[PDB]
Amino acid sequence: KVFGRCELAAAMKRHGLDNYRGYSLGNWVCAAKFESNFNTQATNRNTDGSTDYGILQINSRWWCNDGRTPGSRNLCNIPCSALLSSDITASVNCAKKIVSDGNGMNAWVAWRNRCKGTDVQAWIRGCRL
Numbered sequence: 001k002v003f004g005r006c007e008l009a010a011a012m013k014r015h016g017l018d019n020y021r022g023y024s025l026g027n028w029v030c031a032a033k034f035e036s037n038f039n040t041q042a043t044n045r046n047t048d049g050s051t052d053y054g055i056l057q058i059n060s061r062w063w064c065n066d067g068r069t070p071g072s073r074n075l076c077n078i079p080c081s082a083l084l085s086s087d088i089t090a091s092v093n094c095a096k097k098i099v100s101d102g103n104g105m106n107a108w109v110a111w112r113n114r115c116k117g118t119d120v121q122a123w124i125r126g127c128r129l
């Protein structure tokens, strides 16, 4: 599913990402834009042989099982394919566990490089939220 910006903002807010671990909603919308272009079916292979999945490009080294990442973990206790659904529940639940790590949203390289320090609330402007 390719979300609209306000559509994704509303879904992320409903699922409780607004101000989760102190990150305002626009941070999550910006992260999803630059990680996946708001496409839940996005996948990208990493150099280490792990893969990133879904609207927040969650990685198979630590967070999900894709059955092809040797010596990896599955801390979200999900198949990586769960992160490609039109239903973003599994991606949000897993993003909450990621951002609760001490690195916060710096786990998302696209957030660090294209959202952090910018006016991220621009990503929710115009939306009825």
Ligand code: NA
Pocket: 060, 061, 062, 063, 064, 065, 066, 069, 072, 073, 074
């Ligand atoms: Na894994």
